[PDB]
Structure 1
């Protein structure tokens, strides 16, 4: 058991070792070194600014979490914030360092294998830092606050000095989750505004009197964009997956903890717990062990792929990493489930239909759902398949036709993945109730380290190819690096789709956790069916649902406008710099403006439940959560798939798959308009929604202990 608790440190040390191993490889030409120095300075500047703002917000949140609820809650909040920030910083430094070494491998060896290995060892640092830091924080919470302080021992509803009631350990893990959520909100909202403002400004300066090339170091927005790629597909997506991972695990824990007070019967004058402390604690700890086994299998798959004999098929290598981790987790967790829950009593009252093996059936379902959902994102965004081919071909009909067909593509694309989620939820429940729904969220993210490593591979290869083309490298070297960039292009779409699906699953598990956390000491005798209830006929619930949907749409629109404003401001600063390059100057101007913009979306996401709950109650807030989730899922999938389809249709034409037309032609102009429209949608709105749907649920789960009984109307 202690070995499992050690696995997180193994992953952190693995990250350190891969960091050193890639750092040992050669940087090469001095031109490459200068470009990468620009990139690293921009990245570190952005990181410092955002971490300053993060610390400012986190101290206030921890003080409020200690004043209300308990002090362990605020401590766990800060712990989780630190773990996620650490994973992000480590991954970003590693990526900004490895972007050149990948190109040097490709050039020196004139081969694809060594460059791919360098890039994947680079991304595995972010993957392993995510996994290790997250599960390390969780093990620390489970040991220090969990067993040492006996919060897993009492498992009864505690009433704090203010009168707020809650199960202690549940509230503690909730605080930890909220910490991760703050880190992720900062990363996604802010960094996304920044990244897409930089990309839009890069496109813009090309058309001003400056006549600055897009792929030229003379253009400051080029370096800002190369920094933003890392800010996005390494820090942002990694933090998003980390939040979903921890959310699934915390939801399992909260449901388990609150089942203990739920299933008590007043047989005489005594309250008899129909689910005893043994089973409850076993179910509190089973998710942590499942996730630790997942991290172990992830490290094994990464090891196999980094030591594997070098090959010339990158896509195959990354997919091998994924499938190895998946199957290993499946088998090992099979034995874990069967042996860890075998001798427990009362599992039938918990929803386990086939006994101790029920949740494993749930977990694996998640896994498969995930991969399948991934596939759908690729089907509707790759020009290898029919939809993007049709979109690209329709370019000849005009620009309005490109826009309409892209919107149509996204809207229709939301259905296959939603149906995958629907069947996954139905079957997971069939096996093990809402607990099994949470275990499905976990299984889907059981190998988060490998998923995040493949996600971070993309931007590293993108920067490698960009450095190669900015340094005017040999055409064969450019071919190698561009092939790596295309593989990363496909993996990016798959990873974004997987992240959206994971966010939806974790948000639904958090909704269940919210309902369970509504338990008051006065409902102890009441039948369980009466307490765990959100009635949709209650007009406050319908009203709250409409409100949540509207707030989600408004959130998205505000982010679009913020991106455009920040881009125009960066263009103004670049003009000022030309009249009077400024790399960190423009990077920091845009970073500060994006951080200023983040105030209102963050306040929306965090304060909507507080305001509405203290105003109208916990049924209204349940409605708001359902509306937010239902609209966020759809809008996320839509924006992601539409932007991906537009981008890859432009590529389809640029690759000459549409005879007669190439760069500069009118169809290419139309597709470029479509791609500029979609960039903010896929890289800012979708991920921001992935976060919204979860963080609003977390804030709700926590504050419902207060406003459940403290509401104005």
Structure 2
């Protein structure tokens, strides 16, 4: 209860504590000033865009559905934006202090503590704002208006029949989705255009030094390392977390009228509240793990993760047993082992998540065989390097997907679709620690950008941050896959109609693949996924060229130009993501859109895994060859040329395309779930 406020205050306390850390060096202070100025300008531009789009969409939701939906949309927008702003400011401020600690104390410990404190500020802001928004929505709308009390399908002034509370939580999830969409897409385009331009100025005719303070592109690359790995990745994790919670709530809410009432109101109310309490326990357990951690940084991060996971396991076992022991109609909704069944699913998801990270690591890291084969092959041709990286990513897609399939099967066997959503929530129970670790990465990147012994210590922490960022990217992709699957489940429950309640519940819960509509929608969704990825790449290249032209021709000016180009190019993919469900449905019904959702989820998950793993393998092979474990091949060799080309191709892919894809899948699912009440029946063909 009010645990999110504790997270917000504890995040603010770590902000105040780290501000009291000396900034030391003057050149480093100036670099942090440049990064802060550029990041704040980018914030101003994106916040103007987000304000306009969010107000428009909130008014639209208020028009077509109940006003509570639009209010929750705005609330989610505000909460996610606040979390992102607080975390990004923390990260921009903490890098120089981390460097100062590492330099003065000649030790990695104080620097590690300050960097992890900044990461914790970001993660705590995420969790606290998200869960505080959830609690405010529940307290204001569910109880004061009695939407949960009557728990009846409402018909608004446009003749749209729908569940008010489900539509409101759908709008709140849509707000999280819109914030994550703008953050990840625009920011990632910025981040990879900036890193690409930083590498390009090294290779231009003017030979402006790469990773140079006078280079505007190095400052843009640092700002992007912050914006991408913090705002976009944390936004993705919060979007998947909120999607899972909202999916559980929607599943219970629509199971109430479907099972006829075969399930009492008390059971439905408890199943709606269970993810909320389960989410709160995850936040508390995550903070406990963080507090314990605050010579091996990876060991400390792993300890934080495992403590958070195990504490969640035990406390949620107790909560789930004590709270769901007193409900009726558990078997009808799929609780095989009774009240213990959802908790089981949750822990399963937890394990799935951790395992997924390993697989990402197993393919992305150069310590293991996959990236060693890539580095060894690099002696034989740039094209062969590109082919081997593509093959490695395509091979890497399989093991995490197999893990996800096994987790889905186990969660289903335990507790139906409700426990599938609970397993998603279990995977995201330690999302606070996940966001903290992930936002650690870019602080280390910036510190690296900022004695040879202190340099090597900063390099050590930067490499640890890179590895953790790759692991977090894999984790985010897996969590987004679970969230999209649960959102599809919620959409298909939303397929319910007043005429359908008389029909068998199994007959209602029905999407035949044999339908040409379903098959064609799956095809179209997969095609739109690939077309989205292609236009992402084109936009990134265009933005990089525009920045290079401006540089040839004011660091804030160049950042503003890049931000404006990214925002202008973001409209078309955002338009596609928003309009595909609406247009496809108002033309063909809801079965076509369900097929679209299935195909989009499949294609986006697969491409995201592929791109993330390939880029991670390429970057780690670069580091492998630089450290020289491939004996007899020094810097400047043909393998280095091949790896540089491979990284320039892959880095933008792994850091914007795949995350954009999983944001795409989740937002398309959310928009379909929201619009179903209209466009199931208002369809042209």
The TM-score range, normalised by the shorter chain, is over 0.9
Q: What is the distance in 1 between the residues matched to 2:515 and 2:18?
A: 59
Per the TM alignment, residue 666 of structure 1 is displaced from its structure 2 partner at its CA by 1.1
Q: What is the distance in 1 between the residues matched to 2:99 and 2:207?
A: 28
What SS is found at the alignment partner of 1:345? Answer: coil
Deviation string, structure 1 residues 459-499 (Cα, Å, up to 9, x no partner): 111111211xxxxxx11110111100011111011100000
Q: What is the distance in 1 between the residues matched to 2:647 and 2:279?
A: 38
Per the TM alignment, residue 207 of structure 1 is displaced from its structure 2 partner at its CA by 1.7
Tell me how many residue pairs correspond in the alignment. Answer: 685
Q: What is the distance in 2 between the residues matched to 1:135 and 1:662?
A: 51
Per the TM alignment, residue 693 of structure 1 is displaced from its structure 2 partner at its CA by 0.7
Q: What is the distance in 2 between the residues matched to 1:147 and 1:305?
A: 39
Per the TM alignment, residue 154 of structure 1 is displaced from its structure 2 partner at its CA by 1.6
Deviation string, structure 1 residues 393-433 (Cα, Å, up to 9, x no partner): 10111001100000000111100000000000000000000
Q: What is the distance in 1 between the residues matched to 2:151 and 2:253?
A: 6
Matched, 1:393 2:376: yes
Residues 326-337 of structure 1: pairs in structure 2 closer than 5 A: 326-337=309-320
Residues 124-273 of structure 1: pairs in structure 2 closer than 5 A: 124-263=120-259, 273=261
Q: What is the distance in 2 between the residues matched to 1:464 and 1:490?
A: 15
Per the TM alignment, residue 540 of structure 1 is displaced from its structure 2 partner at its CA by 0.5
Deviation string, structure 1 residues 684-709 (Cα, Å, up to 9, x no partner): 10100110010000000001110100
What SS is found at the alignment partner of 1:57? Answer: helix
Q: TM-score, normalised by structure 2?
A: 0.99
Tell me which residue corresponds to 1:642. 614
Deviation string, structure 1 residues 108-142 (Cα, Å, up to 9, x no partner): 10001110000000110110000000000001111
What SS is found at the alignment partner of 1:163? Answer: coil
Q: What is the distance in 1 between the residues matched to 2:147 and 2:17?
A: 42
What SS is found at the alignment partner of 1:355? Answer: coil
What SS is found at the alignment partner of 1:196? Answer: helix
Deviation string, structure 1 residues 654-706 (Cα, Å, up to 9, x no partner): 00111111221111011110110101110110100110010000000001110
Q: What is the distance in 1 between the residues matched to 2:569 and 2:447?
A: 31
Q: What is the distance in 2 between the residues matched to 1:210 and 1:46?
A: 27
Q: What is the distance in 1 between the residues matched to 2:39 and 2:452?
A: 29
Per the TM alignment, residue 208 of structure 1 is displaced from its structure 2 partner at its CA by 1.7
Tell me which residue corresponds to 1:315. 298
RMSD: 0.7
Tell me which residue corresponds to 1:84. 80
Q: What is the distance in 1 between the residues matched to 2:662 and 2:602?
A: 12
What SS is found at the alignment partner of 1:352? Answer: coil
What SS is found at the alignment partner of 1:110? Answer: coil
Per the TM alignment, residue 523 of structure 1 is displaced from its structure 2 partner at its CA by 1.0
Alignment match of 1:427 (pick from 391, 410, 415): 410
Q: What is the distance in 1 between the residues matched to 2:119 and 2:278?
A: 24
Per the TM alignment, residue 155 of structure 1 is displaced from its structure 2 partner at its CA by 1.5
Alignment match of 1:622 (pick from 576, 581, 594): 594
Q: What is the distance in 2 between the residues matched to 1:498 and 1:535?
A: 31
Q: What is the distance in 1 between the residues matched to 2:93 and 2:266?
A: 49
Deviation string, structure 1 residues 425-470 (Cα, Å, up to 9, x no partner): 0000000000011001101001111110000001111111211xxx
Q: What is the distance in 2 between the residues matched to 1:154 and 1:444?
A: 33
Per the TM alignment, residue 210 of structure 1 is displaced from its structure 2 partner at its CA by 1.7
Q: What is the distance in 2 between the residues matched to 1:508 and 1:363?
A: 15
Per the TM alignment, residue 555 of structure 1 is displaced from its structure 2 partner at its CA by 0.2
Tell me which residue corresponds to 2:468. 491
Per the TM alignment, residue 276 of structure 1 is displaced from its structure 2 partner at its CA by 0.4
Q: Which segment is superposed worse, 203-212 or 339-348?
A: 203-212
Per the TM alignment, residue 387 of structure 1 is displaced from its structure 2 partner at its CA by 0.2
Deviation string, structure 1 residues 128-179 (Cα, Å, up to 9, x no partner): 0000000000011111101222121121111111011111111110000000
What SS is found at the alignment partner of 1:661? Answer: coil
Q: Which segment is superposed worse, 643-652 or 330-339?
A: 643-652
Per the TM alignment, residue 209 of structure 1 is displaced from its structure 2 partner at its CA by 2.3
Q: What is the distance in 1 between the residues matched to 2:298 and 2:271?
A: 38
Q: Which runs of 5+ in 1 are unaligned?
A: 264-271, 307-311, 468-473, 577-581
Tell me which residue corresponds to 2:624. 652
Deviation string, structure 1 residues 490-539 (Cα, Å, up to 9, x no partner): 10111000000000000000000000111111111111011111100011
Deviation string, structure 1 residues 278-326 (Cα, Å, up to 9, x no partner): 00000000000000000001111111111xxxxx211111111111100
Matched, 1:694 2:666: yes
Alignment match of 1:289 (pick from 269, 277, 301): 277
Residues 4-23 of structure 1: pairs in structure 2 closer than 5 A: 5-23=1-19
Matched, 1:584 2:556: yes
What SS is found at the alignment partner of 2:2? Answer: helix
Q: What is the distance in 2 between the residues matched to 1:451 and 1:155?
A: 36
Q: Which segment is superposed worse, 425-434 or 139-148?
A: 139-148
Q: What is the distance in 2 between the residues matched to 1:217 and 1:346?
A: 65
Residues 206-605 of structure 1: pairs in structure 2 closer than 5 A: 206-263=202-259, 273-306=261-294, 312-467=295-450, 474-576=451-553, 582-605=554-577
Per the TM alignment, residue 204 of structure 1 is displaced from its structure 2 partner at its CA by 1.2
Q: Which segment is superposed worse, 516-525 or 553-562?
A: 516-525
Q: What is the distance in 2 between the residues matched to 1:590 and 1:20?
A: 32
Q: Which segment is superposed worse, 150-159 or 422-431?
A: 150-159
Q: What is the distance in 2 between the residues matched to 1:586 and 1:162?
A: 47
What SS is found at the alignment partner of 1:283? Answer: helix
Per the TM alignment, residue 205 of structure 1 is displaced from its structure 2 partner at its CA by 1.5
Q: What is the distance in 2 between the residues matched to 1:322 and 1:88?
A: 22
What SS is found at the alignment partner of 2:332? Answer: helix
Alignment match of 1:42 (pick from 38, 42, 46): 38
Per the TM alignment, residue 56 of structure 1 is displaced from its structure 2 partner at its CA by 0.5
Per the TM alignment, residue 331 of structure 1 is displaced from its structure 2 partner at its CA by 0.2
Q: Which segment is superposed worse, 182-191 or 205-214?
A: 205-214
What SS is found at the alignment partner of 1:44? Answer: helix
Q: What is the distance in 2 between the residues matched to 1:657 and 1:498?
A: 28
Q: TM-score, normalised by structure 1?
A: 0.96
What SS is found at the alignment partner of 1:348? Answer: coil
Q: Which runs of 5+ in 2 are unaligned?
A: none
Residues 43-82 of structure 1: pairs in structure 2 closer than 5 A: 43-82=39-78
Q: What is the distance in 2 between the residues matched to 1:75 and 1:63?
A: 9
